Amino acid sequence: SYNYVVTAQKPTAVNGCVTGHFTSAEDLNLLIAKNTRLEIYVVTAEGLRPVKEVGMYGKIAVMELFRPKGESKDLLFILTAKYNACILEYKQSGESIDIITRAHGNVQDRIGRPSETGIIGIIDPECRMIGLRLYDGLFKVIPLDRDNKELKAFNIRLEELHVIDVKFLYGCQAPTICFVYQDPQGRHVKTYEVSLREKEFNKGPWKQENVEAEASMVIAVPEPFGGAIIIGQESITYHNGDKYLAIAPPIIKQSTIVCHNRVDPNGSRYLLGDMEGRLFMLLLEKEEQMDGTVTLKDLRVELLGETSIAECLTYLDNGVVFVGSRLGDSQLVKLNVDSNEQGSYVVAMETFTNLGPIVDMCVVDLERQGQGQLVTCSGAFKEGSLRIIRNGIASIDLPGIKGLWPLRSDPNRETDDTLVLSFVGQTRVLMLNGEEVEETELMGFVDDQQTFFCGNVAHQQLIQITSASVRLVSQEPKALVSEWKEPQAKNISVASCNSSQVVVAVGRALYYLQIHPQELRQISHTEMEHEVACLDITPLGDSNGLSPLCAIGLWTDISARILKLPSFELLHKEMLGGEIIPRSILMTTFESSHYLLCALGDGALFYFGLNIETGLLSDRKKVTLGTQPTVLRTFRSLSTTNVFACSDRPTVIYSSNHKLVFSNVNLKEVNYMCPLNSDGYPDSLALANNSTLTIGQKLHIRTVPLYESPRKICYQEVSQCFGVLSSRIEVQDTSGGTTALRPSASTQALSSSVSSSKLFSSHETSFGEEVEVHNLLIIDQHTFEVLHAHQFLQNEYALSLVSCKLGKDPNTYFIVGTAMVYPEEAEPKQGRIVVFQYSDGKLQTVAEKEVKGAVYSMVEFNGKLLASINSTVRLYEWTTEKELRTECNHYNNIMALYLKTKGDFILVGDLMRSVLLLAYKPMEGNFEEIARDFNPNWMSAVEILDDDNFLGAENAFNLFVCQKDSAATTDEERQHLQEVGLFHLGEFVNVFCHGSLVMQNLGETSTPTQGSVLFGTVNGMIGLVTSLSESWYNLLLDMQNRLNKVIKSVGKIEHSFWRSFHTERKTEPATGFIDGDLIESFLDISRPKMQEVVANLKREATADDLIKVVEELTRIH
Amino acid sequence: MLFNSVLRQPQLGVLRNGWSSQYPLQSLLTGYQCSGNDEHTSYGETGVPVPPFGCTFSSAPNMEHVLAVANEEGFVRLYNTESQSFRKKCFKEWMAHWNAVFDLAWVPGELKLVTAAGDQTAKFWDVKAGELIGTCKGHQCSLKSVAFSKFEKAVFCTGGRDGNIMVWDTRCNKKDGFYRQVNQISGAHNTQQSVTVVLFQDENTLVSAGAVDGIIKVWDLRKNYTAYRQEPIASKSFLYPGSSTRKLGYSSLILDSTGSTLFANCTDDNIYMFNMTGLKTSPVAIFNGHQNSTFYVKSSLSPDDQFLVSGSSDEAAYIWKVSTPWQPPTVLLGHSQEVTSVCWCPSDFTKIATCSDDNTLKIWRLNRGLEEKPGGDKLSTVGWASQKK
């Protein structure tokens, strides 16, 4: 098995944040570590300005900024989840930006349990050493000497095994730690005066105290006050020597504080996060004494309004506050000095997108083009949502547009102050006084004829080529400098002009014209019998309208005749297919090689490769489109010209190096358009629709907020609705019943129902208990409004959900597998597989089928449904009586959480027994264990890649591929599932789904990869695991090794070590998994450096070959 | 709870409970049942049943299921565990010694096995192709333990009834077919001063226990103890923390996967859980509820370092949760004689080989399908797990 893991969307969940002077000593910075990625910003007056983003070779787990003595800008310390410590210094050498590494090296220990409450990394305020609490009972101290280039850490044994949080006290003449440890007597705070000289702890400045039983973190107050702040869940305490004062504010008892950050440099004000998004402020009153230091008076908390579920808080300059989120959007709030409404001081300013915890995902196409769009059940808790992720990039009912063009009546402003909008029988000029839009037809242009072209020629004197007549009119001189009328007086369907030359074709008559201001001469009047529907003249480049070569099409087969200019003789006859005449013929030039697009009426485009050297028609690769006519034209986006096709599926043909991309721009329907880069719509071209006049990253993300956590989703084509499984959380009322915290998408659902099951007629809820209520939402596919909300039974959770046709019933059914869970029970004992049917605006419970155990997963199986009933795989047949019936039971699993199927093979991923492959025997009617993986892996997601390859996803962020050991014997040797793939993805994989976000449309271009499996992770990453061939796998492995030899990581971390299959029990090198990011990075490298990789190996093995391999591979991404 | 932990994982992500596993699986411990097929009787040379003592799993790739076993006549048999056929389990048998075998150890990452015997010698075996590589000699009495460091496959150490501790190196000169001690710790556990169990925490650190002194000692192998000329001084020494005044002795030593914590059965029917990565010499947890009357009783840890299973002289195996010692243990009834050298399978959480004096090596496996469809009476299942009350 050989695969190709690439990242369709980089992770967006925020792990940690820090601020300081990183880029330079003057400009403030904000560093965000979105898992493997690091983002450096500059906090300007208008907000964050992106500067540099680097992909660290590891899961960033510690981020701190320190300023050693003798340094101008602060250094950055990063410690990955695999213990690869490194010190990073920003270095902007000229316009080039790079991050050098001052020190690196592993800090992992062979002996020592990874401590609870995660990795804690602290740096001395004096910036003389670094302390890390990686393991229980140990405290690694890394001296910060300039000569410590390898980060030679030394261990320090300490008595208190269980440490909750470590912090460095400010103002101590020697390095001093302050931590809250736990012993059977209860949580205590004890400080140590660590010394680098003896490499051992000493007695602390102040006596150990007994803190609240749930003290969670330590805040080190700066010099003016000193000491430490110990915030817990109910009380907040301040410890400094003999001074000790505590507060018990009821406003924080509701939920526990998580994040904290210092606001003022003196430490007077502190921010505090929360589970529920609350953003407290911890004020510190200043009590100046007669002669002593400025002691504190008392602590005082305040409520500053609700925000996103905070994972990092970072008080930036002025009053803005960055609030990073792991379960929602990471907004950037502003602390208003005066309360505005509802007692909240925070006003959101710039909400940043975050796909967050993708619980479930499905691939569908709504517009029916074959290009699916991701519909993920993103978010969690109060910030749950439903993102519409799709690849690639003014309705005013009007007749069919016969022509659009920028009428630059401005002298040189290059702004379309007028826009000649033309119909078949009418023509109106759209005057645009800046961003204004009004119709004032100019006196210099007629409207009685359907105009075909109104471009400019020279001396800023425009032309106006109408139907049955041609009338050039100078606009700024306001004089008819040339009124050469059309001698044929026919509809001039073809009117080509560029710079100071115009070559029109009135139906079937080409004329050689030297069209100049006050010079409109009819030198030639050549006329052929064949009609000329489209023709254009374009210069080769900077030349003023000089085109030595020209091409002419035909009618019976549209043979693009190519003639050599020096000879005008036959060199090589060319023939093309297609009987229907093309709608438009366009000469296109994005790269050195030119491409003559042939937009036929059926939508098929034959972009022959035209060459100035030869001009012969190259290979005829066909890009299909809809039956609507396609019109091709050049549009202005950058300094390099580009084209913009128009059809029922508009495509921006943005060609890369030696490759033509046909990405579909997010437009419903376009046939006629004109380029426009005005101030009103800088990025939206003036884009007329089929009958309406409108004006206008690669992974566009829509947001549908739900205000509750979605669990699973599915699509129902028959009903055109979704099947989201959001679960609300409401606090139990003091007088009985439940009261929702906020109005979610479940409450504001038109026509909502309540389940009335009588199966469970056989648990006590306190006033403070928070019971969870699970509903089945039904979301329309177009407006995304909640069409239904079927609340389930009390104390009943919903886990699995599928929509499939069952048995012989033609109706499409909504089947949900629920599970009653009481607080006392460790595992659910009663479940339900309830099947609905969205007939019309309502859900009818057709069947109930009470089961004994949780229904962890469900999926359709050959017209039957099988469910994982709490470590028991049962197969249900849909009887004609509309009742599920048992069949094909299998008691050989332990919490079979995940089921996948393909044909007659079931891949039942277990909880800790790895993947099991089952088989349904039709005539036997019983399940058969074909094969089973044996090494335990703690599965999190499974997928059937092929008939043999079985993808997996360990909860330790590791991917692996099983494969049936065919080369063996049946009796216990063919039952062995042998692992082949091993790969440390670095992200927790939540769901696997087939399909790809890239369109295919029968694009038979010999794709090197087979299949496509998108997966979603907790951090919002979306991958595109594919399958490669043996030769391509070997070539890509060689490329990966060479790139590793050449490319230097930002943290000096070896790629082979980062991608090794890491687990607490084993650590194996990556096998059978080609990294996608590393290979795709080959394109961005400079040519002299790419030559280093290329040299000394295919046969020739030269940079063009490797570049085309990587470019072909990157297309799936 | 188990269900809530699995349910919350997709949203909250990975959270560290403290042990290797990410879920609390203490609810399913009651499903352990040993079928009648796994009742292998280690028959002796004469044909009468013989009590097997000392039986551990292997670690070679693609073979992390073979369970070796030894008895009082020196027979060593390799047992398949995943397969289900009474006569197919014994695919390898031979005479390791003529004077019983007291311990076994599999070479890490390889299919090589070493037996500790009463012949005052330790053989080196190639189980891939039956042969005797060598016979280490130098002990003045019967051996009692053999330990292999998982970080160094070619170095192993033994502790004999005579009382001194010697570490061998297979890479050393073969000489005349007899291996020679590299470092020797003479009189390691002086107050019949037998070294009950030797263990390897790291490539260099070695942990030992005594049958009479009752103090666990930690030795580093970098220094040479052969020329010490006095009683060697251990780098660390975990003193006896119990209350009984009698001269006690430990019977088994076990570490977790990370090598930090240490579990040591003692004669006072307690399993003290020390910590070897800090200054807290005093024990962390006290597991009790069994009868550790005999030195043959040993224990083993779960693969996720979450549960500790130990033998007992009350014909039962006890499984405590490593985080909650106060909770009553899960008792694996089914044996009529004492249970010794229990070995939880490191490569499979389900398999627990409850090794016994009853002349019956039982392999316990999880049975989550308790309801199932047939019952098979009590003939099918010979062992039932039940929480102690």
mmCIF file of C-alpha atoms in Angstrom, chain B residues 23 45 226 315:
data_model
loop_
_atom_site.group_PDB
_atom_site.id
_atom_site.type_symbol
_atom_site.label_atom_id
_atom_site.label_comp_id
_atom_site.label_asym_id
_atom_site.label_seq_id
_atom_site.Cartn_x
_atom_site.Cartn_y
_atom_site.Cartn_z
ATOM 1 C CA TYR B 23 -10.356 5.926 28.527
ATOM 2 C CA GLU B 45 8.028 -36.559 32.323
ATOM 3 C CA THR B 226 33.499 -7.195 41.331
ATOM 4 C CA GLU B 315 -6.555 -19.543 44.739
#
